[PDB]
Amino acid sequence: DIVMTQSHKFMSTSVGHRVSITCKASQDVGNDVAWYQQKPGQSPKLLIYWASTRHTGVPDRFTGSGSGTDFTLTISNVQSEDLADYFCQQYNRYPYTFGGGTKLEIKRADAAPTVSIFPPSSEQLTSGGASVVCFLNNFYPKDINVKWKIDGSERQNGVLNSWTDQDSKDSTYSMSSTLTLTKDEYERHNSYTCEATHKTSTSPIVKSFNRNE
Amino acid sequence: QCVNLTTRTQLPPAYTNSFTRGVYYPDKVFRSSVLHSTQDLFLPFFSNVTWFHAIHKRFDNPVLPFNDGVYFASTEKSNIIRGWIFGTTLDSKTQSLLIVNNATNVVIKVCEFQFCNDPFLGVYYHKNNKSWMESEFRVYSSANNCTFEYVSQPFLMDLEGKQGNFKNLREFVFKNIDGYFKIYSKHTPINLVRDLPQGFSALEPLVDLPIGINITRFQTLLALHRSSSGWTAGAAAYYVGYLQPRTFLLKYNENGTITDAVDCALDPLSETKCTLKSFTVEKGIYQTSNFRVQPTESIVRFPNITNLCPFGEVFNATRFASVYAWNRKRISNCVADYSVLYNSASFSTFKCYGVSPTKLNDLCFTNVYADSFVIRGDEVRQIAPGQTGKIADYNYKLPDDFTGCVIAWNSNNLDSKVGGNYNYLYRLFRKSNLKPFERDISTEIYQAGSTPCNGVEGFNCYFPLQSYGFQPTNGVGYQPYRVVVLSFELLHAPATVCGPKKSTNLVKNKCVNFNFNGLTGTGVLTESNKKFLPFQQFGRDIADTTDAVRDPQTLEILDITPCSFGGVSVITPGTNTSNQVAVLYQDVNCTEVNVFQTRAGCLIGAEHVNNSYECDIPIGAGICASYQT
Amino acid sequence: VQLQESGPSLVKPSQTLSLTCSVTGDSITNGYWNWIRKFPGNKLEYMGYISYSGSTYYSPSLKSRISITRDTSKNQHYLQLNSVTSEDTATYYCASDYHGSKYYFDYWGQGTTLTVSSAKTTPPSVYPLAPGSAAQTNSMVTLGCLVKGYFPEPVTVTWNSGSLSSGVHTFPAVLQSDLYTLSSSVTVPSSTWPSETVTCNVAHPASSTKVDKKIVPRDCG
């Protein structure tokens, strides 16, 4: 097998700038250097084959060169549709040995997120269950902190965080936060809220409701 | 801790010069009326030392390095400068030295102190009954793993801000050699306004701290007096120098106090004093040092771009053999240049195993063999170390320490015929496994079951040398690949061909280090007028001195000219008469170095006068120097 | 040319995998067929291949465990894995490799999740999440639909039987000790609530359970 060792596991770039991914393979592959194009939520696709010819339907803004081991993929004029995980591998013979992985991040302008928190329905209170879900969509960046403030007190029990990949339509993020609690832990409190501190403002976006309706 | 003072005025770190600062006592040996030299970390004269401030308009706390040695000169009039911070990276990751002064004792503790972003001192409650008592202690945060603790004698220091000029001088010498810390101190009353005096002083040691830690960065602690970012400082100054391993002269009196120091690398006037080891130098010309031109470029020439191995004919041939009866080609007496094979852009299957390809060019192997054969496209992975199949166990077994390469390309229009090509054969079955790099051309009929074959076919008796199957309308991977296996082996034999000669372009007409195939050394490659032989390599003088070289494949005869060398003679006047000296090197000219050329060398620092006077200072070749008004 | 995976999502150990990745966009005339699993954490590993002519060749690491066949009649391919275990839980991808006009083409599928476990199945409890009328006023509103208490992974949660795609954010589950927890949000205008009701459709392929729960603003007028 061929070990395709990479330098970094994640890189970031902006719209209109130039990025470069350095993948120093430990074994010689020659001019047969292949690259991938993996949209988030879909399967990877072939982007660059044989290091000198582009795929059908790919613009000429993707170049590449190298000599022996120092292989660097030069990406110029990064657009919003260039969100892909570029992988370095070899297509000499079977099996197709693949590399570690590099996730590309696309930078853009700020956007207003959407924070919404829901009360449990009447069907959960009939059986004896409860579920309070906090939402945080179309936000930037991913290095944020979602904390639960039940009646002004911070609670870490039953907090579930699930981060997803970057969306390929508007280059935003999307996640959620579910609070696991029973019916006895629901009737002892009235106000539920959740905040998310971002870099767009010093004050986080608040969202509260009232269970008494 | 994390809150910095907002009373900081931006100022670039300007530099200044000193006259005779940075001279101390190197040892505890009492001498009288002698002039001896020593070699230690000293501050050279006329050096670029820093120019900082310790006032309330500009309050800056810079961080200077420590591994090169520093000199700490500070003026004080109102007890603003208190201590300092020593450490590796100014953090609590390791042990650090902290010497502070809270006007009661000298606290010297070696712990893992948590240094802040800007530690400082401050006096609070200046409304009523102040008495200059410190209350805020923001030097360190915590203390853990202490190895040393020292408490000095108790005293009382007046922290009242005095007005007027400077009154005290506290110059320190900080150095660290192999962990053994050394501290020098000196205190004397002065009268200054802004800068350091142009005088001379000596320093004496106080304590010895054999800690054993390395210090790379340091910061000077300053105190402030406010009548958490509105603190105002007083009025002080401190300079930071850079020590160098130089050699000074120590003029000892009858009491052992150094009165003046002489540098041996500042000016040619003082370089004559280090030779005679005295301060009073009479009128004359003496030798000081030796002149030498250092080389700046290494010279490595090539023999030719020819004599290469035929990689375009061996690795691109047409007629090959089978996988069991392949032809082994011998590679010897060439240049194995792999630059035309890595970027050839004509091989669809090019891979190497074992190690990095950059290590194969810098390491020479003994046995370089080529195993070329034509196989199908279904078992190409079996040509690898640690594989099983019909090739690695029946046709061609490879060892585990295989560092060779696999070279193949598309041959769908060359080795494919309509109906099946039956020119090459391959072994199918065998009774046991093979050896690494073993050829098997036997035609023994394999016996699968218990029925004997007796050389012919029959029940469980199949022919082992079956035929290949090629088709131009087959798959794109099942095309016949002309795989050429390159064998590498490192043994006790001398290496022959792995591309030994790797060099580049060369320069000439400079003081460089030549390195040819038959002669190396140091010399200037100048033009020659001799006549060389086409089979020679270089030439020598009578008494075993290389003075001639020859290019391998270029009609160019060059000599080995020595560079500008010789002693350094400096014409110096008396110590009570004048101070103007001249620079005179031996056996040089005025081109390779008040400029005049003599037979002994170039005289720089003397104006040529056509009037002939009396010879007072001899130079050479009928030229002398005098001192005229 | 885009492939599509199909089949079950829960196979017991010491059994035979039975999957089907169909081919849509190109007929089976020339090319190959690959199958590469994806470990969680961006890790890939080759398994095997089979040509369209009838030649089979497997990996030397997994000799008798990889068994991939072909079918040129219905333009589909079968994916079988012998001697399954708990370490074979990965994201399966089907790919093809064919040449044309002296170019290299490599197309892939969409993605499927297969989990090998010997534990019993758990029926999901799909509960709706209706927002309250006494909440904070905002120009944009969201709808929620949480599934709690199902086992094992994976599931198929969508909105309006896959016909709704405006602002649909499908989120994966969170690994608890025994169970899982789903979450989904659909960006809708404020004029639709509470006039329009959107029904989430969550499918459980590990136990063949499909529960449809309509988000009704109880009580209505």
Author numbering:
A (entry chain B): 1 to 213
B (entry chain C): 14 to 69, 77 to 247, 255 to 620, 641 to 676
C (entry chain A): 2 to 222
Describing publication, verbatim:
Spike (S) protein protrudes from the surface of the spherical virions and mediates virus entry into host cells. It consists of an ectodomain comprised of the S1 receptor-binding subunit and the S2 membrane fusion subunit, a transmembrane domain, and a short intracellular tail. The CTD directly engages the cellular receptor, human angiotensin-converting enzyme 2 (ACE2), and functions as the receptor-binding domain (RBD). Moreover, we captured an ensemble of cryo-EM structures of SARS-CoV-2 S trimer in complex with the Fab of 2H2 or 3C1 up to 3.8 Å resolution, revealing the MAb-triggered stepwise allosteric rearrangements of the S trimer to coordinate the binding of neutralizing antibodies targeting the SARS-CoV-2 RBD, also providing structural basis for MAbs 2H2 and 3C1 as noncompeting antibody cocktail.
To disclose the molecular basis of 3C1-mediated neutralization of SARS-CoV-2, we determined four cryo-EM structures of SARS-CoV-2 S trimer in complex with the 3C1 Fab at distinct conformational states, including S-3C1-F1 (with one Fab), S-3C1-F2 (with two Fabs), and S-3C1-F3a/S-3C1-F3b (with three Fabs). Among these structures, S-3C1-F3b was better resolved to 4.3 Å resolution, and the other three were at 5.6–7.5 Å resolution range. Furthermore, in the S-3C1-F3a map, there are two RBDs in the up configuration (RBD-1 and RBD-2) and each binds a 3C1 Fab, while the remaining RBD-3 in the down conformation can still bind a 3C1 Fab. In addition, we also captured the S-3C1-F1/S-3C1-F2 structures with one/two RBDs up, and each of the up RBDs binds with a 3C1 Fab, while the remaining down RBDs have no associated Fab. Interestingly, compared with the S-2H2 case, the four S-3C1 structures with increasing number of associated 3C1 Fabs reveal an overall similar pathway of the S trimer to gradually coordinate the binding of more Fabs (please see “Discussion” section). Strikingly, our structural data further suggest that for the 3C1 Fab, although its epitope mostly locates on the side of RBD, distinct from that of 2H2, it appears to follow similar pathway to induce generally comparable conformational transitions of the S trimer.
